[PDB]
Amino acid sequence: VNNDPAFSTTTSTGNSKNDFSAIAKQQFGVPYKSSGEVCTEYQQVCQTWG
Amino acid sequence: AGYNEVQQKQAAATLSSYFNNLRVYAAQTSVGVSNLYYILSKRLPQNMSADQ
């Protein structure tokens, strides 16, 4: 909830560009395989989180 | 206190729009109303002598 810019307690006068999206300034991430690559599927086994 | 420039200026513009339209209408109407009060007041009593 604190990540949400719409729920920002302070005024939105800071960085309006660094924000990940309109719903979160920092992304929660996507699971990654044990190779540093995007794990878009489950059969390709995901172990890390990048 | 939870405000932004965009909607603040838009609301100010709308309020000034209503107020300016009202003032313009008031002046334009007052033109004709002054005409009417002049045409009536040509026929009202006026005391002339300084002694009642």
Coordinates of C-alpha atoms in Angstrom, one line a residue:
Chain A
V1 CA 0.0 0.0 0.0
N2 CA 2.8 2.4 0.8
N3 CA 4.2 1.6 -2.6
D4 CA 1.1 3.0 -4.3
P5 CA 1.6 6.6 -5.5
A6 CA -2.2 7.1 -5.4
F7 CA -1.9 6.3 -1.6
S8 CA 1.2 8.6 -1.1
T9 CA 0.8 10.4 2.1
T10 CA 2.9 13.3 0.9
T11 CA 2.3 15.5 -2.1
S12 CA 3.2 14.2 -5.5
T13 CA 6.0 16.7 -6.1
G14 CA 8.8 14.2 -6.3
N15 CA 9.9 12.1 -9.3
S16 CA 7.0 11.5 -11.7
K17 CA 9.3 9.7 -14.1
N18 CA 11.2 7.1 -12.0
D19 CA 7.8 5.5 -10.9
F20 CA 7.3 2.0 -12.4
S21 CA 3.6 2.7 -13.2
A22 CA 0.6 4.7 -12.0
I23 CA 0.0 2.0 -9.4
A24 CA 3.5 1.4 -7.9
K25 CA 6.7 3.5 -7.9
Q26 CA 8.7 0.3 -7.6
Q27 CA 7.8 -3.0 -9.3
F28 CA 7.2 -6.1 -7.3
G29 CA 9.2 -8.2 -9.8
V30 CA 8.7 -11.3 -11.9
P31 CA 10.0 -14.8 -11.2
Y32 CA 13.1 -15.7 -13.1
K33 CA 14.6 -19.0 -14.1
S34 CA 18.0 -20.1 -12.6
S35 CA 19.6 -18.3 -15.6
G36 CA 18.8 -14.6 -15.0
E37 CA 16.1 -14.7 -17.7
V38 CA 12.4 -14.1 -17.7
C39 CA 10.3 -17.0 -16.5
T40 CA 7.1 -16.6 -18.5
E41 CA 6.1 -20.2 -18.1
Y42 CA 6.2 -22.8 -15.3
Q43 CA 7.5 -25.8 -17.2
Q44 CA 10.6 -23.6 -17.7
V45 CA 11.4 -23.9 -14.0
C46 CA 11.5 -20.6 -12.0
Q47 CA 13.8 -20.4 -9.0
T48 CA 15.0 -16.8 -8.7
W49 CA 13.1 -13.5 -8.8
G50 CA 14.4 -10.6 -11.0
Chain B
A1 CA -3.6 19.5 1.5
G2 CA -4.5 17.4 -1.5
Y3 CA -4.8 19.8 -4.5
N4 CA -3.3 20.0 -8.0
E5 CA -2.7 22.9 -10.4
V6 CA -4.8 21.5 -13.2
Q7 CA -8.2 21.1 -11.6
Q8 CA -7.6 24.2 -9.4
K9 CA -7.0 26.4 -12.4
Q10 CA -9.9 24.8 -14.3
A11 CA -12.3 25.4 -11.4
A12 CA -11.1 29.0 -11.0
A13 CA -11.7 29.5 -14.7
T14 CA -15.2 28.2 -14.5
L15 CA -16.0 30.4 -11.5
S16 CA -14.6 33.5 -13.1
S17 CA -16.5 32.5 -16.3
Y18 CA -19.8 32.6 -14.4
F19 CA -18.9 35.8 -12.5
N20 CA -17.8 37.6 -15.7
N21 CA -20.9 36.5 -17.6
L22 CA -23.0 37.8 -14.7
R23 CA -21.2 41.1 -14.6
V24 CA -21.5 41.6 -18.4
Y25 CA -25.2 40.8 -18.3
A26 CA -25.7 43.1 -15.3
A27 CA -24.1 46.0 -17.1
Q28 CA -25.9 45.4 -20.4
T29 CA -29.2 45.1 -18.6
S30 CA -28.4 48.2 -16.6
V31 CA -28.1 50.1 -19.8
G32 CA -31.8 49.6 -20.6
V33 CA -32.9 49.9 -17.0
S34 CA -31.1 53.3 -16.8
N35 CA -32.9 54.2 -20.0
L36 CA -36.2 53.4 -18.4
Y37 CA -35.5 55.2 -15.2
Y38 CA -34.4 58.3 -17.2
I39 CA -37.6 58.2 -19.2
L40 CA -39.7 57.9 -16.1
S41 CA -37.7 60.4 -14.0
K42 CA -38.2 63.1 -16.6
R43 CA -41.7 63.2 -15.2
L44 CA -41.1 63.2 -11.4
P45 CA -41.7 66.2 -9.1
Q46 CA -38.7 68.4 -8.3
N47 CA -38.8 71.0 -5.6
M48 CA -37.3 74.2 -7.0
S49 CA -37.6 77.0 -4.4
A50 CA -35.1 76.8 -1.6
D51 CA -37.9 77.6 0.9
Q52 CA -40.3 74.8 1.7

